[PDB]
Scaffold this active site. Structure first.
Site, PDB file in Angstrom:
ATOM      1  N   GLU A   1      -9.178   7.044   6.335  1.00 30.29           N
ATOM      2  CA  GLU A   1      -9.589   6.338   7.352  1.00 30.29           C
ATOM      3  C   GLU A   1      -9.182   4.811   7.425  1.00 30.29           C
ATOM      4  O   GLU A   1      -8.274   4.365   6.415  1.00 30.29           O
ATOM      5  CB  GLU A   1     -11.121   6.218   7.337  1.00 30.29           C
ATOM      6  CG  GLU A   1     -11.598   5.036   6.452  1.00 30.29           C
ATOM      7  CD  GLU A   1     -11.335   5.408   4.933  1.00 30.29           C
ATOM      8  OE1 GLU A   1     -10.253   5.650   4.594  1.00 30.29           O
ATOM      9  OE2 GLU A   1     -12.263   5.137   4.157  1.00 30.29           O
TER      10      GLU A   1
ATOM     11  N   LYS B   1       0.884  -1.016  -0.046  1.00 34.29           N
ATOM     12  CA  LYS B   1      -0.029   0.158  -0.005  1.00 34.29           C
ATOM     13  C   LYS B   1       0.846   1.263   0.001  1.00 34.29           C
ATOM     14  O   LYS B   1       0.195   2.500  -0.555  1.00 34.29           O
ATOM     15  CB  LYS B   1      -0.992   0.230   1.339  1.00 34.29           C
ATOM     16  CG  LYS B   1      -2.030  -0.896   0.926  1.00 34.29           C
ATOM     17  CD  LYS B   1      -3.360  -0.524   1.398  1.00 34.29           C
ATOM     18  CE  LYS B   1      -4.652  -1.283   1.653  1.00 34.29           C
ATOM     19  NZ  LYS B   1      -5.735  -0.896   1.798  1.00 34.29           N
TER      20      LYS B   1
ATOM     21  N   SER C   1       1.789  -9.658  -0.701  1.00 31.15           N
ATOM     22  CA  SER C   1       1.395  -8.301  -0.613  1.00 31.15           C
ATOM     23  C   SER C   1       1.891  -7.433   0.555  1.00 31.15           C
ATOM     24  O   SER C   1       1.767  -6.443   0.771  1.00 31.15           O
ATOM     25  CB  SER C   1      -0.034  -8.265  -0.774  1.00 31.15           C
ATOM     26  OG  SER C   1      -0.801  -9.171   0.176  1.00 31.15           O
TER      27      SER C   1
END
Ligand code: NA
Ligand code: NA
Lengths: 249, 394, 390, 256
Positions: free
Chosen positions: B108, B86, B376
């Site tokens: 958030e 990410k 990931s």
């Protein structure tokens, strides 16, 4: 078609704005909500705006999130919502009944099969909260194929491009959120809906040139305060509705 | 209206309240500009390399393929700064936001990994960052909340009923409505309204590009298949992108199977849901017969999303991608295997991808298979989740 | 021996006779592997494709604002496992395999060296046993589980003090008997020969990579590379390549604890005294009559009462310059790097960082190309920093 | 110079092995330790080796680790041990005394100054636990300058190279612990090493006589005697009498 046009007519030659309360169908229960509906009419509500409880209301604030949660956890289904609409329309066959929908409840088994149901039960308008004018094409079609007025929010960040499209596509009323020229473009009459908590705000709206006002949070905030006391709830709604609709005269 | 196409076949769109449309359109326009600007492409690339650590390694599994004809590579997003893939999209969007003049990031988080991603990118590019977190998850995640605040972010717990990820999501979204002139909303997946799926793929597609280059060096051919877990779809589209026009490369996405599909507590909308309109987009989702949004379930928080990025729905409709599912239990055993026989603690998300590769291997152990599994992210965050299951089981 | 056990006066093999055969066998194995290009490439494949070398060389953006300092951070926090110790642990595991050894012994306190040895053992198929003070086994349930998840065997020692210096005792006692089947993974560049040499050699790629990357992004050698010195392994791995580049300052930062004059520091290089301990002749913090005295620092990894023998030497010949940073300076550098660079450093490395900000703020007109070795990720220090702030 | 040779002489004249107890000076306290030491001598201990409490003892096991913490925590210091040694030597001028030392305590402020204090107070031998023969040059030097016997451990992984080294550099006795244990003891006599004492696991009298039978000159028991001390901390006089019983049974197990 007519129920909305027949209402802004007699409201304009009585020289008075319209008051539309907003409540979630089936909040706090099916039977109590029916009573809430009637009280609002008998206190001088010119039209209704009923919401259908949805598991996920993106575009509604805190008090309406919780009213939505009440009816949804209690098990109010969209199908039940239509049986109540049938009772409503048959008791007050003259009053404009708009719906506030969320896209997926319209789309679920055919955009068209939905708007058909609204037509055959007596609904008059449908605001789809999460469908902007850019994505509306299939909803404006089904809407018009069944004589249902599509309502569009006109926000305070609206440019001339959108004011055009709201005027063309939008029928019934145009739900706007706070000095404009929607009338210039021949838009359906405007109903102010930003923060209508006071009677003061309502006459502020009419004085500002609007055909009327909608108050959501204020009316269901009353429902929330009186869950334990259904009869207080009804009486306190009468006080408020009559006090508000009167600030439009 | 729309510089870029907002749809991938049927799926995608901008299904949002009118009031948000100017923010999406300004975002789309700023993004188109920056994609053409070689100084932005260079600045982003410098960040990815010298701050986040790209390129990430491509690890060949020495042990767990033993006695078989399959060769398992692991694309090591777990080594990226921040521990998960990410960071790519987060540094991308912070760059985009500083370019737009914006001085504030909205975000958030649920478990809290995305909050930390945002906070660290905000700290680096001098953006004031505010993160909404369900009041519940603030109790559960005192360590993450402290990292975010260590990095200057402002954690804003929400109580509004619910009080989890899809409820901060409202406060953060509502906030954005009123401040899009001043703040960028950092969405954390390849899902939601246009242009977010497209921006997110573009800021993640270097995972596939590195992988193509790295496998060509080590093995002189393209992989038979790349495998990635599919919660929101961001890591999978980042691995798939460069392989989309290489027809010979199988694209396999793994949705969380929960306790089993037939039990109906999974998170596999692509294969076992229905198209509806939600989270700003038209996508396959898990929903009831009257169109309420169903809850998804997965032991992995990352995979616990009741829909999926629209470009994945499009890839599945036209036959390019194959989507499968892996249960909690399957993912649990993959996770332990990798710790024990490779010295890598995977995140429980990527563990779903690992588990499906080992299945492909253990069902045809004499088939020559060159597979890539996208790791990931790091699995340190999941140590407690895993310990409790193994304690309950003995 | 084959190689020189001393660095000037410092170093040696001060261990019980029983342990000399193990040490000579280790040295001979190492000398052999250093000249096998197939070991060199194997070790190097591992470092790149499993551990992820090279590690980033990151340029601070906001930290040096309004100053002529240009501050790079060598990013060993991005190495697999979160710290520079992965380098030496993989190399020792490879060497142990080359010797036919099938087992690994190791000692840990907070648990990060235990985790490194566990992951290296899980990769390379070795059976790994890790000694750890029972004190430290309940204060670190996560790492214990990680070591068991990644499953070595964690053997808790209840002897006297359940602390790292009492797990060294039984780890070594164990190696004493089992050196023919198990390799002892010493966790720093201290101790008896050949360990200080082996550790330097399995870390020197930190400095090599830094020299290349910096010659690529600034076209010159740096003015000074800065590293914290506890055991000494990340520092010597940063220094090694620069030793022959006179212009390049080698700055090593010991922990000053509460302050040198409070006696609760960990800076034996500049405030200790040469003694014999842990198998080597090196400066150590010692009482007047020769007891080994306790070091203090809020960073665990820097809480060592001695220092690697090569740093004592580099300081005797004046090639390296050793300073100190206090608990509180380190703390403020921890906070700064999180707030303005989006990197959470270990409390160890933030002693080095803090000194770079001292060198920057005292001469902010001065042009300085500084590199700081970020020796480890700081996710492990959150709770230590949370308490300290109340 | 004298005491180890004069002792080992008469031991094999009356044909018998030596028994040597290890204790830690000032364990559990100074005045109790002197009494412990007097009991050991009065029950037949031919020589004795005393350890100086060091803060970080590595080459030592769990029983000795704790005897050490007891004297260290109680603030016994090397200076206090040297006073004890003097009081001990002044009252038994005969018996050989060996110290068991850690390098740093010998090195602290001068290898040579340390060995001159040994000689100045009456010590006979020093074993430095962590100085292998390879590093022993300065310690052997200091020892011979001061007529202190240097003791070296010959471990069981000991090759012939180390045995020759040990046989040449050792004085007093060889501290003994992979071909027959006797082919370690025989190789050492062949190189003319100082007589061997077995110090591996000498805990019961049946191990003492097994050690003498295999060919060693005697036996050393570290932890067994210290074990008795840890057992009787509460009871100082029961302790002295359990040691008297144990040492005399140990010394008798070596009367061949
Ligand atoms: Na999903
Ligand atoms: Na130190």
């Amino acid at each position: 078609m007519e129920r909305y046009e027949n209402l802004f007519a007699q409201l304009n030659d009585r020289r008075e704005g319209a008051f539309v309360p907003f409540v979630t169908l089936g909040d706090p229960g099916i039977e109590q909500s029916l009573k809430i509906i009637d009280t609002l009419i008998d206190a001088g509500a010119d039209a209704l705006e009923l919401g259908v409880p949805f598991s996920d209301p993106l575009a509604d604030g805190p008090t309406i999130q919780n009213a939505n949660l009440r009816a949804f956890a209690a098990g109010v289904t969209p199908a039940q919502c239509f049986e109540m609409l049938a009772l409503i329309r048959e008791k007050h066959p003259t009053i404009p009944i708009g719906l506030l929908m969320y896209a997926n409840l319209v789309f679920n088994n055919g955009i068209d099969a939905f708007y058909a149901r609204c037509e055959q039960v007596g609904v008059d308008s449908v605001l789809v909260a999460d469908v902007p004018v850019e994505e509306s094409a299939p909803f404006r079609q089904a809407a018009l194929r069944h004589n249902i007025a599509p309502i569009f929010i006109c926000p305070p960040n609206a440019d001339d491009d959108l004011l055009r499209q709201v005027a063309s596509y939008g029928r019934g009323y145009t739900y706007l959120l706070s000095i404009e020229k929607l009338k210039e473009y021949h838009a359906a009459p405007a109903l102010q809906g930003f923060g209508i908590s006071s009677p003061e705000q309502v006459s502020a709206a009419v004085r500002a040139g609007a055909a009327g006002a909608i108050s959501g949070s204020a009316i269901v905030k009353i429902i929330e305060k009186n869950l334990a006391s259904p009869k207080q709830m009804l009486a306190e709604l009468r006080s408020f509705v009559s006090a508000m609709k009167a600030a439009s005269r």
